[PDB]
Design a protein around this ligand. Structure first.
Ligand SMILES: [Ca+2]
Ligand SMILES: [Ca+2]
Lengths: 590, 590
């Protein structure tokens, strides 16, 4: 037939393949309407567990008008520009200046404007390649009263309290007090110490972490993530630099070969420096109730974080949080791909033309080569983002961990003033005694630093970012869905089973890479999974995500990437398949 | 209907949009069969103008067996892995060692193996988004006997002789001798001093450059590349670093704000250094006939280039050649997009949700925001690559400029030995006597440096890369098709009419960015077109592409990008369009 007709038929076949995968129904946890207004004469839902950031809130962190949230949900489901614009975003405005009236003096003195919701209807956006955003479902998010949410808040608060703690020094004596405190606190939670029960949903079983040790503290459950150093090699190490190539028998060494261990990626003929901008140590955000409420009322605090001069390789938890703050969508993965290409990590052996050219007579650049994997790793990201945007806005609308911390703080402060509010987080508040006391001490220190000589006690989750979380619900995670999708693309495309000869850790004292003491072997697949969950738990480290968000959106991203790979496999006449090890330990051939 | 049905219908509508765009026929120049074997007894095609790299060649640069090239074309058109593997790639191999017998002692001493054709059948690959690779055609390439090809190889040789000349010193007295030589030599050519005649095909009229001046020497003809400094801002300057944001009334300044003028793009929380690896100045490649013939016989010389320690902003022509040597597919454009996002260059105002959030109540990250444009600019690249691979291998199969220079060198050496071969390039040889003798002098210096005390005279085109061109025909250009596609994506997505306040140039003396002496204004569209031209002409500066290849593949890439934008616009229910200025000066709304 005609080439144009063949192309149309291939595209229609890809669309049909997407259609026949079927739509997995997306069930939420029912938190949206199950929590009601505590006022006896008000039977309206409180929407405390729902993402209500941007909607006006009362002094306790709940929305004054549930109709605002209902209009927000209607705008999410419709996607119309006008209906979104008709939403009430932020607090009441000044009649004269037109500026929103902020509770915190900081947001008022800055004359902060409101910030809109980030792509509330991107989940309604179709995609021409890969699964539809609404065809793949995440499991219901943990409920506020569940031990899973309590453990997620505990781990979030422990990371927030341990932001200035180096990854290479998790087992170091200097951090031992905090690390043992966090391990004991997590192991004192039903979610971690008690295993999953029979009859629980399979996803809840899969994402339930066991006993928390220093080896797996703040680590993901992806294979190869608890094994080796914390940070993936591709997030801290550079790559074989330009000029370090094997030409026939002689092996030319690049004059800049030290840049590989200096965290410099061979980005074409220029370099990507793996060193991250140093956010100011010990400077948490959204630790004061007024500032937190303003941020919940859409106070545009973006870019208000201060940074130290220069850049350094990710050493502290705050460094990883800063890294995931600004990463350009697929940046972690794109950098991982660039390292793998520059390091000469072989593509998947089942890809065509991967043999020596004396055998196949074919280099691979456009198809099954560097350009192919770069394009796939950077194009899976937006499809995964659309899927996760659907999950965030249209299905779950889960409140961000800062909002959960606000509920916890208000609930804990209520007995001080003699009242009681948010019994839905009572189990979390009682379970996390010492965690919340340490968080209160750190928050009081931060609020004194902010300029309050005698701040009210605050148990808010310390935020690594001034704006806190982005303006989207926490379930799922855009960063972790892109992590899952892009790392799946890389593991399928590259020889993911290739062992990594040199395992590096960031030095304990100096901003440099040192040969890690890890005596085991790290695979490319394991280190890519480690990179994916490094991004995911960096989002957790910022206080913007719970662990279940990260794991389930990593699974969603893997589904996105697998679907995209199946649809692209119809476009190649070459006899080949991608050898993709999934996050559950199995391998799918695409 | 259902969401799955709506998604399938949207994808089918995009496929129908691709199909209904039609397939413009791809015509070649007929050079494949119009040049015949000079032997009276042999009436087979010589294939001298055809891309014959990797097939065995005689001592004069032509293939020994035209059946080898015919099998190569059959393998290109079929795409079968086994049929490509059956192609005779490289010269005869050693029976005892299995290694090919290289003519040059350099390739034999290196024990060089063969390099295969880089995706000789990637043009048969279909695509799920945008035009099919074969649905869009480039015009026929200039013939070896055309004045256009003479001017092309002339500017190629002038770039090769001018590889050590700084872009900021084109109008400087220290380079004035060579610059005036190049200007007078180009203006002495029919292609430049004579305008296009009536009746010429419109593509040749459009791509015919006028009088060569210092202000447009080695420059493209896209709108915005001939005005201002030579290098685009997006290839030399950095971007607003992390921490240099405006939060309400106050304007926080990044402590690393000097990195913006130090060529450090804010790549999320880490930095992309715009400093290119410094290839050894003066070291050209394939200046000796034996090494050149080995490279034509697929000598795997990749990575054999030497580099100076460190990195620097692109100053010399060789720096741009080195930059386009290894650039990761969409790297120039991805970096341009990162600069535009970090600099806060607004997206297209016709995109939705671009107003202040007090008006639209919507941020843009996944759709119509940073993630959207990054994904688009990286996904258009592989589709443009497939289209250009079709153009290269299945349609045009045009010989690389190194092959043209080899024909020229053999034709010029033939009268020295009493013979006469390649009369097809006689017009080029006679029109370029001054340039060819300058190139012979430079080639003699290079060959003495290579280790030949008294090398034979050589008029080979000096190559910036040790392997010379990639294993692909020159018409079209993957780099320039990706430039066209990605710059089109960026100009559509970003407000391309926005004028850049700060115009920088690489300092004449120090490796740094001084304020350019350009008193006019530069726009984002103009600078992106300049970036595309920088990439395309940098491929020319390597000696791997002709100018017409670059320009027509830039047009092909613009077509690819417009197609992809038109397809992807059906995935959005938002009322919007991309305001895309084209390379022809018109604007299309998508
Ligand atoms: Ca191969
Ligand atoms: Ca907006």
């Amino acid at each position: 037939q005609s080439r144009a007709k063949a192309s149309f038929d291939t595209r229609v076949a890809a669309a049909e393949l997407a259609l026949n995968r079927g739509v997995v129904p997306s069930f939420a946890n029912g938190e949206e309407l199950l929590y009601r207004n505590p006022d006896p004469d008000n039977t309206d839902p409180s929407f405390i567990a729902s993402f209500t950031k941007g909607l006006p809130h009362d002094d306790n962190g709940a929305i004054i008008d549930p109709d605002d949230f209902l209009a927000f949900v209607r705008a999410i489901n419709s996607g119309d520009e006008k209906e979104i614009a008709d939403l009430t975003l932020g607090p009441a405005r000044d009649p004269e200046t037109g500026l929103p009236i902020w509770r915190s003096d900081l947001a008022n003195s800055l004359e902060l404007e409101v910030r809109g919701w980030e792509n509330s209807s991107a989940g309604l956006t179709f995609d021409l390649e890969g699964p539809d955003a609404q065809s793949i479902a995440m499991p219901p998010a943990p409920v506020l009263t569940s031990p899973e949410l309590v453990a997620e808040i505990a781990e979030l608060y422990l990371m927030a309290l341990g932001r200035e703690i180096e990854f290479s020094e998790f087992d170091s004596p200097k951090n031992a007090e905090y690390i043992q405190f966090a391990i004991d606190q997590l192991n004192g939670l039903e979610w971690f110490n008690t295993p999953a029960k029979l009859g629980d949903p399979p996803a809840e079983i899969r994402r339930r972490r066991g006993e928390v040790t220093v080896g797996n503290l703040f680590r993901g459950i992806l294979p190869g993530s608890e094994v080796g150093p914390y940070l993936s090699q591709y997030i801290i190490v550079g790559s074989k630099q330009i000029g370090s190539a094997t030409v026939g028998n002689k092996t030319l060494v690049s004059p800049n070969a030290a840049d590989e261990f200096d965290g410099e990626i061979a980005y074409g003929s220029i370099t990507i420096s793996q060193r991250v901008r140093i956010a100011t140590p010990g400077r948490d955000f959204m630790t004061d109730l007024k500032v937190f409420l303003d941020v919940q009322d859409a106070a545009d605090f973006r870019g208000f974080e201060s940074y130290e001069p220069g850049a350094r390789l990710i050493r502290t938890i705050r460094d990883l949080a800063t890294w995931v703050h600004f990463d350009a969508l697929y940046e972690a993965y794109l950098n991982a791909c660039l390292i793998l290409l520059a390091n000469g990590v072989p593509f998947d052996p089942n890809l065509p033309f991967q043999q020596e050219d004396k055998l196949d007579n074919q280099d691979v650049f456009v198809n099954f080569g560097s350009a192919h994997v770069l394009s796939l790793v950077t194009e899976v990201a937006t499809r995964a983002l659309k899927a996760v945007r659907y999950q965030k806005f249209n299905i779950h609308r889960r409140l961000r961990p800062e909002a959960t911390g606000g509920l916890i703080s208000v609930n804990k402060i209520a007995p001080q003033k003699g009242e009681s509010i948010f019994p839905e987080v009572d189990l979390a508040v009682e379970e996390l005694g010492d965690i919340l006391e340490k968080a209160e001490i750190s928050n009081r220190k931060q609020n004194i630093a902010d300029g309050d000589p005698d701040p009210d006690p605050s148990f808010l989750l310390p935020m690594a970012f001034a704006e806190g979380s982005p303006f989207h619900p926490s379930y799922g995670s855009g960063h972790a869905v892109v992590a899952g999708a892009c790392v799946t693309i890389l593991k399928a495309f590259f020889d993911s089973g290739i062992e990594i000869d040199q395992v590096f850790e960031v030095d304990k004292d100096e901003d440099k890479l040192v040969k890690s003491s890890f005596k085991g072997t790290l695979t490319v697949a394991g280190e890519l999974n480690k990179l994916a969950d490094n991004i995911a738990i960096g989002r957790n480290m910022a206080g913007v995500h719970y662990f279940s968000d990260q794991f389930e959106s990593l699974l969603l991203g893997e589904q996105v990437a697998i679907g995209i790979l199946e649809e692209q496999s119809l476009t190649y006449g070459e006899n080949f398949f991608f050898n993709l090890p999934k996050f559950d330990g199995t391998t799918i051939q695409i």
